[PDB]
Amino acid sequence: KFPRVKNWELGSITYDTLCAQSQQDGPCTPRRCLGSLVLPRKLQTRPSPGPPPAEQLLSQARDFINQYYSSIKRSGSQAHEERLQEVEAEVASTGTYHLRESELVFGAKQAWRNAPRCVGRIQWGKLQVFDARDCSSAQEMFTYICNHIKYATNRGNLRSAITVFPQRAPGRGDFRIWNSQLVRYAGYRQQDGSVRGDPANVEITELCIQHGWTPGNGRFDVLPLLLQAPDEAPELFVLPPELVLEVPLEHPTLEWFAALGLRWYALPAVSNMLLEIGGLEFSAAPFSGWYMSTEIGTRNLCDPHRYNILEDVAVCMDLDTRTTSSLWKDKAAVEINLAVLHSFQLAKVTIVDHHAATVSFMKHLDNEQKARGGCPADWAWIVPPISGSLTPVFHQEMVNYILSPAFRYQPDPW
Amino acid sequence: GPKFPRVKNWELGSITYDTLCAQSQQDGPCTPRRCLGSLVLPRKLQTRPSPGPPPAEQLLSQARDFINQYYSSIKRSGSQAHEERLQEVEAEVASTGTYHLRESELVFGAKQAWRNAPRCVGRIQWGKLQVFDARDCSSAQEMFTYICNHIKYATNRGNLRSAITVFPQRAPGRGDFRIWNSQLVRYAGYRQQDGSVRGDPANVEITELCIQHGWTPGNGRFDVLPLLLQAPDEAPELFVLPPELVLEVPLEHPTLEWFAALGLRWYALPAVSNMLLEIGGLEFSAAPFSGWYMSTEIGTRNLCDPHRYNILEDVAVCMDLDTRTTSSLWKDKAAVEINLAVLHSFQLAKVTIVDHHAATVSFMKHLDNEQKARGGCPADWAWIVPPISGSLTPVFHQEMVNYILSPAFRYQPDPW
Numbered sequence: 001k002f003p004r005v006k007n008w009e010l011g012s013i014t015y016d017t018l019c020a021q022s023q024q025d026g027p028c029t030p031r032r033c034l035g036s037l038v039l040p041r042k043l044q045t046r047p048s049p050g051p052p053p054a055e056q057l058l059s060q061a062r063d064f065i066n067q068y069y070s071s072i073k074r075s076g077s078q079a080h081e082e083r084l085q086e087v088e089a090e091v092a093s094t095g096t097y098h099l100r101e102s103e104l105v106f107g108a109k110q111a112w113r114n115a116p117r118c119v120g121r122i123q124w125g126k127l128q129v130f131d132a133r134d135c136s137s138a139q140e141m142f143t144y145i146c147n148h149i150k151y152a153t154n155r156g157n158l159r160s161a162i163t164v165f166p167q168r169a170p171g172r173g174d175f176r177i178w179n180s181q182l183v184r185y186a187g188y189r190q191q192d193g194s195v196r197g198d199p200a201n202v203e204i205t206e207l208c209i210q211h212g213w214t215p216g217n218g219r220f221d222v223l224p225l226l227l228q229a230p231d232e233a234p235e236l237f238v239l240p241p242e243l244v245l246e247v248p249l250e251h252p253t254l255e256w257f258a259a260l261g262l263r264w265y266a267l268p269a270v271s272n273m274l275l276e277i278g279g280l281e282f283s284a285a286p287f288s289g290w291y292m293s294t295e296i297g298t299r300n301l302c303d304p305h306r307y308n309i310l311e312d313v314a315v316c317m318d319l320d321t322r323t324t325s326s327l328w329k330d331k332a333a334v335e336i337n338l339a340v341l342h343s344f345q346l347a348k349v350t351i352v353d354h355h356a357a358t359v360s361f362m363k364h365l366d367n368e369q370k371a372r373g374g375c376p377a378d379w380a381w382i383v384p385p386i387s388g389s390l391t392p393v394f395h396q397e398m399v400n401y402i403l404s405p406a407f408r409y410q411p412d413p414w
Numbered sequence: 415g416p417k418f419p420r421v422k423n424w425e426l427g428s429i430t431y432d433t434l435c436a437q438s439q440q441d442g443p444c445t446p447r448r449c450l451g452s453l454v455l456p457r458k459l460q461t462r463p464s465p466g467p468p469p470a471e472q473l474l475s476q477a478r479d480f481i482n483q484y485y486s487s488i489k490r491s492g493s494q495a496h497e498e499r500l501q502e503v504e505a506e507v508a509s510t511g512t513y514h515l516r517e518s519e520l521v522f523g524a525k526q527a528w529r530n531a532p533r534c535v536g537r538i539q540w541g542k543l544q545v546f547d548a549r550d551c552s553s554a555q556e557m558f559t560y561i562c563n564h565i566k567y568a569t570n571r572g573n574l575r576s577a578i579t580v581f582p583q584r585a586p587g588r589g590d591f592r593i594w595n596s597q598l599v600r601y602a603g604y605r606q607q608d609g610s611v612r613g614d615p616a617n618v619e620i621t622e623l624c625i626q627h628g629w630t631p632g633n634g635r636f637d638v639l640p641l642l643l644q645a646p647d648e649a650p651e652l653f654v655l656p657p658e659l660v661l662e663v664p665l666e667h668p669t670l671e672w673f674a675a676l677g678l679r680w681y682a683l684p685a686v687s688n689m690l691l692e693i694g695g696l697e698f699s700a701a702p703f704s705g706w707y708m709s710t711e712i713g714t715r716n717l718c719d720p721h722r723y724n725i726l727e728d729v730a731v732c733m734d735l736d737t738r739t740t741s742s743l744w745k746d747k748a749a750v751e752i753n754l755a756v757l758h759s760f761q762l763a764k765v766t767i768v769d770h771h772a773a774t775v776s777f778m779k780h781l782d783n784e785q786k787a788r789g790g791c792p793a794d795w796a797w798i799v800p801p802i803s804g805s806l807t808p809v810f811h812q813e814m815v816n817y818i819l820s821p822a823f824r825y826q827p828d829p830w
């Protein structure tokens with residue numbers, strides 16, 4: 001049952017015993033592996049048609065409290081058995097329960113620590129948790145968010161942070177942030193099917209316009225937020241320009257690069273995922289850290305269904321775009337990633353390259369093997385989009401499983 | 415909707431369902447509890463030498479599945495020729511404990527094994543494979559004659575042709591036909607006194623086995639190894655490939671003049687020879703197959719892997735790059751130029767080669783051809799996406815379902 005895990009660069013071997021703690025099922029079976037699938041339908045977080053079984057919830061709850069008390073080394077103590085009873089009496093009576101701030105802080109950190117697709121988990125212990133459970137309006141969500149952004153950005157010296165809004169309650173709508181990230185660029189479906197801006201944001205941009213936003217016409221127009229309080233229509237909120245930090249891209253040696261007019265924001269804040277802690281679900285819990293240069297230079301700027309600048313850059317570099325064997329694509333992508341690192345470093349904004357990032361992840365995997373006897377990792381996401389085998393994680397076998405607390409995907413609110 | 419794995423292509427936003435996986439009769443390493451898809455050698459396709467024949471009934475079920483597959487491919491499923499063949503296989507297994515394949519059946523199974531290989535990006539060529547029947551072979555000496563013939567035909571002076579040579583199957587109460595080498599062409603790995611390794615670090619053991627068996631070792635970085643061929647119940651015999659049969663390509667860069675001075679080179683023919691070909695339950699322990707190289711395999715893996723030649727730093731220093739800081743992306747720049755050299759050099763020498771962009775584009779075409787043909791295609795994402803410029807190829811944006819279908823090429827324990 002326990003996986004023999006091997007690193008092919010070093011020849012070392014380890015056994016993942018942490019996978020035995022996984023209580024949630026993934027999409028794979030012995031007949032076929034679906035590890036490469038981006039999204040689920042089974043691992044998804046289905047709405048509350050009513051309160052989920054008290055036994056099931058109480059089981060996840062007790063396990064979390066147990067995890068919390070081990071965390072502070074006061075396991076088995078009186079403080080522990082009293083807390084387990086509080087949780088049980090509360091579920092038995094109301095069908096749900098509530099967490100203490102310190103449990104929520106522990107839970108939030110464990111959620112990040114448990115995320116298999118995150119290559120930045122070495123930073124898991126340093127996370128600023130903002131308790132925004134004292135929120136009752138879209139207006140209040142906005143204030144909290146602005147404060148999250150101000151703190152997280154920190155003049156360019158980024159700090160990891162998460163804001164937790166009210167949990168889901170049975171028989172009531174969810175608190176939701178309609179945007180996938182707090183900061184994203186608009187995607188305008190310009191007449192001929194083409195899209196000015198980020199093609200991945202066509203739908204959300206249309207929804208913003210539908211809710212009163214007067215749109216722009218640039219390639220990098222920061223989008224407004226659609227915040228939604230329970231059973232209420234989403235409200236539109238324009239983020240103050242002084243709050244959104246952006247880095248204009250330029251190349252260290254290629255003078256003409258800057259003329260491309262490219263730029264990217266400093267803060268990567270995912271705001272569409274569900275945070276699950278002890279059976280409870282927080283539908284609104286935006287989190288942020290800092291960028292790995294490849295997400296910007298490779299994925300966001302070079303993906304075919306995204307900005308797709310690969311060719312424009314290759315033409316400017318005067319590369320042989322006629323044939324694939326000239327490797328014009330590979331050369332252009334490397335220069336774009338270098339431009340991102342140069343630009344962010346020049347602007348004094350936090351950034352980390354894929355080589356440094358994966359090296360740190362290897363250290364993290366080692367820390368975790370010692371600490372918990374394994375570490376859930378999703379190979380396809382941990383290995384960077386360019387230069388895969390050039391990094392240490394490529395040659396490292398990994399085991400992927402679901403551990404709780406956990407960040408999960410959830411249905412779009414519309 | 416449909417009760418099958420839903421697969422999405424994120425670049426195009428298109429959806430497909432894999433119904434072919436339903437026909438998988440063999441389990442992989444994953445369970446709903448955890449995914450072990452990233453593991454290289456899972457104990458699944460692994461075939462530990464069964465002392466005797468397969469259970470008459472287990473072999474029988476596998477045999478029946480293959481015969482059905484065969485008749486279905488020639489469009490005679492349910493016919494008298496089909497039912498007669500099924501009876502003939504059962505009768506043969508009932509009296510002898512095993513059975514034998516008709517020539518066309520062997521050709522079909524061999525092509526299907528390639529078609530079914532999850533990790534092969536070059537499967538769009540599956541239909542055009544030359545199958546050499548070597549089931550008459552009876553000595554290590556003859557295995558060598560057959561291999562040299564394969565190498566000659568397959569190499570074809572630089573205009574490579576896919577081919578597989580099938581030696582006699584595993585037999586009850588009779589040793590196996592084995593090729594000790596991992597590939598027909600491999601460079602030697604010499605363990606230095608100082609601990610280092612000259613040549614290919616990956617080939618240290620086979621090199622030492624060659625020496626233990628009479629090989630007089632050289633001491634270069636690119637010394638082609640001799641073959642250790644093994645016939646039934648005999649010790650392996652050493653056979654040196656005549657130099658003129660092993661085509662090699664001196665590597666040079668199209669603009670960086672100094673690259674040629676590095677003295678780097680690579681052989682033109684990739685021929686895997688340590689895998690077991692399984693068809694209808696019959697095992698062909700010796701069945702070397704070859705095709706042609708995808709540039710990344712040479713320039714990125716073979717030449718740049720830290721546990722292989724590891725030439726990244728040397729090329730970086732030559733390009734005068736900052737190898738003291740990761741942010742200079744010195745590794746990336748060098749690897750790109752190393753891959754361009756492999757492509758430029760093979761094209762210059764008139765030897766078949768395919769860049770990772772052209773290969774993945776063609777695999778996308780293969781995926782479409784197989785959706786319509788079989789209703790899905792077993793693919794191992796981690797092995798299909800190139801070791802460099804991953805998201806720049808169309809396969810990165812294509813979800814994939816991985817499973818084991820038979821006939822198949824499986825891993826098997828080293829003979830020693």
Ligand code: HEM
Nearest residue numbers: 112115117118119120123160287288289290291292381407
């Ligand atoms: C410290 C800096 C960080 C870096 C450099 C980093 C980098 C990455 C990268 C490259 C990915 C893979 C691509 C993707 O899924 O979009 C990822 C995924 C992820 N990270 Fe991190 N991360 C960081 C901080 C954080 C923080 C603060 C959290 C949560 C508290 C977090 C949670 C996750 C999760 C849940 C995913 C998966 C998202 C999905 O499934 O789409 N990360 N991270």
Ligand code: HEM
Nearest residue numbers: 528531533534535536539576578703704705706707708823
């Ligand atoms: C025609 C050109 C071909 C190309 C460009 C090609 C390319 C590749 C590549 C890149 C791999 C991935 C690396 C690896 O797994 O070792 C691979 C794997 C494989 N190919 Fe192909 N291939 C070709 C021909 C063939 C042929 C002719 C056969 C068999 C008849 C074959 C059988 C396989 C198998 C079984 C593997 C898996 C090896 C493993 O388990 O590691 N391939 N191929």
Ligand SMILES: O=[N+]([O-])c1cccc2c(Br)n[nH]c12
Nearest residue numbers: 268287288289290291292295
């Ligand atoms: O840097 N990244 O590539 C990246 C991807 C996805 C999420 C995050 C967060 Br939250 N910080 N950085 C991230």
Ligand SMILES: O=[N+]([O-])c1cccc2c(Br)n[nH]c12
Nearest residue numbers: 008394395396397452796797
């Ligand atoms: O070493 N690994 O752990 C590993 C995982 C997944 C794919 C590959 C390839 Br292709 N080489 N090594 C790999």
Ligand SMILES: O=[N+]([O-])c1cccc2c(Br)n[nH]c12
Nearest residue numbers: 684703704705706707708711
């Ligand atoms: O080109 N390749 O990278 C490659 C890898 C593994 C096996 C083969 C064969 Br057989 N032809 N090409 C191959």
Ligand SMILES: O=[N+]([O-])c1cccc2c(Br)n[nH]c12
Nearest residue numbers: 036380381424810811812813
């Ligand atoms: O699109 N995909 O099929 C797919 C599979 C596995 C990983 C990724 C990433 Br990271 N982006 N797209 C992916």
Ligand SMILES: [Zn+2]
Nearest residue numbers: 028033444449
């Ligand atoms: Zn799997």
